[PDB]
């Protein structure tokens, strides 16, 4: 039935993550810049990612020398994909042998040619690293790729062929060669979503961004030139989805258009016509395109749009679409169900109905996709733990957490700790601390970073402390003592032992109030430069 | 009230005149060819996704001109836009078709309204302004009515027709020459595709596979008069204009998009103003350019206006000659009017081409309209004259629509002359072909037309005939230079002395005057060819024949292009 989106990660022009992405959208920021000479010597504009050469190959058990031979599209998605899992609150341990499919939108080979680097391998990186067992399939339907992938993952989950799916897209523009409405400006990006059956997501107590309640794909078929759109195919696609899944156009209040700024009028007419077949209501449905902010992120276009929509729903807020002064002459808005939203405003819904939105993505090869997303409506000291594979990254992790807590005054401290305990892998470099308030939490992380002694803070490298924790691992009364500590109160003791490498049973910390996993900052990868050898 | 069309001349793809035009229409011929390299290299501009059309309705010999005929120095001819040269010829011939000549047009209050929309030749060169294009004919023939070029794109010649009509009705002019001319000289201009052109190079009017138009070249002219004047002057009348109107699309979706509402208003207002019932109309020559969004809008508009007034179904045939010749742009209106007049004259409807399956966006079955693809009799009920409309819509949004009604009217001495002997020979050839092709020609009307409705120029021939066969034989004998005692020929400048006697002597003049009545044609003939002025009216007593359409001057085919 319904598919839950339980994890997301994103890296788009002007946005290193989904929180910056949201902030940029709220403030109507445009990330399009002139192409610098460090890329190539110069349309002279692009929605660019920063530091596309950066990778943490050691994290992924990849030899540094192999990293130079990897398409950065592979490298960046590997990172974003992984972070999507961590966002959902899953780790290497909990993913091991999971029937998780990987569906990766990808549509260019630039690095391989400039020079392992097949589409087939690009999709297979994450399954190989995490020991996943669902199929790994790259999808090249051009700009519809990530949304096509979403559809396929959706169908596999519903048929119970997999129990989880990582869907995503990645697009870089590396060469000069591969490169009011007047055409589009190319964008770069990488995004991933983690999908589950809704019933599983609720039983597993995942945090849920939203649910997919309908999706479809089809073809333009014979058009006037292979890259031209078909009004009829777009209409059929949208109609068939709404009819198959019992979705009334009146229930939809936002559509993230394909909206490349070429094509535009055909898309508008199609969607308008389909809506009007079912309702007389006027100007109820806002339309936008994040391509106005970040450019045309190609294979990653679908996932960029889906993430925008989920963020909108989560904040119950509609954000401006950009570059709109006067309506396209070829379409008449006044008596349409559609209106272009250029305001930052509250996303209003009537009588506690869940917000619904659509995302469209159409490819130059004629393969179309369209999905319908519905807002999800859900029914003392804590022990904070952090770890990373190097001390430098632990420090970066602490900074990321401090920024996050500073930015989010309403964070549930118990949920956050719980996520750090159960929703992250305990790696070799460790710190832990107690806090009973936001202020104490921020102070602790500050103290850690500034190296100001603080009696609530514990840190160790696990390999150094082996002899010191053995006393607890094998003896029966030591375990009983630890269990008494963790069953339950002293937390200081649990903390000291945990940072030294002792495995803790985090479940025992909680009698019949158990907190929930929430979205937190994911691993801060080492930012090492790798390019052509 | 009514405006009589009393003369016509046309030059379209596959048709050097309106007689070939008619033949091509009857036989359902498509004139659209691939563009030859002698025009430009399509391979150097062609891209299938640059130009994406390689086809055109082309005129032949666009470089040919007879500058000496028009008192133009040969060297100036190279500097003249061929659009000007071509119209200058076609206009002049329209007058001759009507049976008017330099003498009879001198100082006439004749307006000239010329559809023209392009400057290619002038640009290539870097005299050739639109203003001068329209003014050539007035300058040559000493006409005194206003000379105005009309550029409303593809509606140009039909807007000109409306303006000429209103001037004639308001008695500001006594005659009008209306026309249009379009050539496509460069890859650049024909090019603009803007998405306009068909990749298949056909105007698929009314068809579901309509995907743009193919550019066409053409030059056409009509001579208009008030009907009352046309009847008093005993003109031959092709048809009458009984209504016309022009308007604007206004604000559309894109300045080149059409407006359903404007087309409906245009047509409705015309019919209401002039008391024309849609049921009385049996053919419409559509704008019918074969564009995907344009065609269905035109159909729906016209259908709707007809349906407001009648429940009758499928009584009005629709077609578009653009299916035959391509989209002849500024000349589109005049080409359509000329088709309709020819249809009326022959009481015949002809096929519209490239029609396989009706446009999905319009349902014909319950329409007053049907697409005619048959060569068939144009039937009318009772006594009633046939009525037809022509529509022409421009890319700039200025529309025109006229309503034409069928007109229902209540030995001989043949003389020919040209400015050079070579052209006289060509004139004799054209007449022979005409007489051969037209087995029912009235010999007395024809002679009368050659006598009174053509200028006596310097190289002359004349002969007697009492039958078609005799006429054909004489012209054959003339052409073959094989002796015939009833054929006379001379160059007038050579014969001045042999004629003077009849110009100055009182008794000679009295003898010549008796001859004209004495019933002696041989004598009149010998003298006329030598340059003697003959009072042709004296040849006729109780019965005077009527002017009819004959082949016009066959211009020298001299090549002029860029200097």
From Swiss-Prot, chain A:
It is found in: Cytoplasm. Residues 1-375 form the Ketosynthase family 3 (KS3) domain. It comes from the Bacteria. The active site is at residues 143, 258, 296. Involved in some intermediate steps for the synthesis of the antibiotic polyketide bacillaene which is involved in secondary metabolism. This is Polyketide synthase PksL. It comes from Bacillus subtilis (strain 168). The chain holds residues 2874 to 3462 of 4538 of the full protein.
């Amino acid at each position: 039935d319904a598919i839950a989106i339980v994890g997301m990660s994103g890296r788009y022009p002007g946005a290193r993550n989904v929180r910056e992405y949201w902030d940029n959208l709220v403030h109507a920021r445009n990330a399009i810049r002139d192409i610098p000479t460090s890329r190539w010597d110069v349309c002279k504009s692009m929605g660019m990612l920063d530091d596309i050469e950066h990778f943490d190959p050691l994290f992924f058990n990849i030899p540094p020398s192999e990293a130079e031979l990897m398409d950065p599209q592979h490298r960046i998605f590997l990172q974003e994909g992984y972070k999507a899992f961590e966002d959902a609150g899953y780790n290497a341990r909990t993913l091991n042998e999971k029937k998780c499919g990987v569906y990766l939108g990808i549509m260019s080979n630039e690095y391989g040619v400039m020079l392992g680097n097949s589409f087939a391998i690009a999709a297979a990186r994450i399954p190989y690293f995490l020991n996943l067992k669902g199929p790994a399939i790259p999808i090249d339907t051009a700009c519809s790729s990530s949304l096509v992938g979403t559809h396929l993952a959706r169908q596999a989950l519903i048929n119970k062929e997999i129990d989880m799916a990582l869907v995503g897209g990645v697009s870089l523009y590396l060469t000069p060669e591969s490169y009011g409405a007047n055409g589009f400006v190319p964008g770069e990006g990488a995004g991933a979503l983690v999908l589950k059956r809704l019933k599983d997501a609720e039983a597993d107590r995942d945090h849920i961004y939203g649910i997919i309640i309908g999706s479809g794909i089809n073809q333009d078929g014979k058009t006037n030139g292979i890259t031209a759109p078909s009004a009829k195919s777009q209409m059929d696609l949208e109609r068939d989805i709404y009819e198959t899944y019992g979705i009334h156009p009146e229930s939809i209040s936002y559509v993230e258009m394909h909206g490349t700024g070429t094509g535009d009028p055909i898309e508008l007419e199609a969607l308008s016509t389909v809506f009007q077949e079912k309702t007389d209501k006027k100007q109820f449905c806002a339309i936008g395109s994040v391509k106005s902010n970040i450019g045309h992120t190609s294979a990653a276009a679908g996932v960029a749009g889906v993430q925008k929509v989920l963020l909108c729903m989560n904040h119950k807020t509609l954000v401006p679409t950009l570059n709109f002064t006067t309506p396209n002459e070829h379409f008449e808005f006044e008596h349409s169900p559609l209106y272009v939203n250029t305001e930052l405003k509250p996303w209003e819904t009537a009588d506690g109905k869940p917000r619904r939105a659509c995302v469209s993505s159409f490819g130059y090869s004629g393969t179309n996709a369209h999905i319908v997303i519905e807002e999800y409506q859900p029914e003392r000291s804590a022990l904070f733990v952090l770890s990373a594979k190097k001390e430098k990254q632990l420090k970066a992790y602490a900074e990321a957490m401090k920024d996050f807590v500073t930015s989010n005054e309403d964070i549930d401290l118990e949920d956050m700790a719980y996520t750090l305990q159960t929703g992250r892998e305990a790696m070799d470099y460790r710190m832990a601390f107690l806090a009973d308030s936001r202020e104490m939490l921020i102070k602790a992380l500050d103290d850690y970073l500034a190296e100001m002694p603080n009696g609530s803070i514990f840190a160790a490298h696990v390999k150094t402390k082996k002899s010191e924790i053995k006393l607890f691992e094998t003896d029966h009364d030591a375990k009983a003592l630890l269990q008494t500590w963790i069953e339950k109160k002293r937390l200081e003791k649990v903390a000291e032992l945990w940072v030294k490498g002792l495995q803790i049973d985090w479940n025992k910390l909680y009698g019949e109030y158990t907190p929930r996993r929430i979205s937190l900052p994911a691993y801060p990868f080492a930012e090492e430069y790798y390019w052509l050898p």
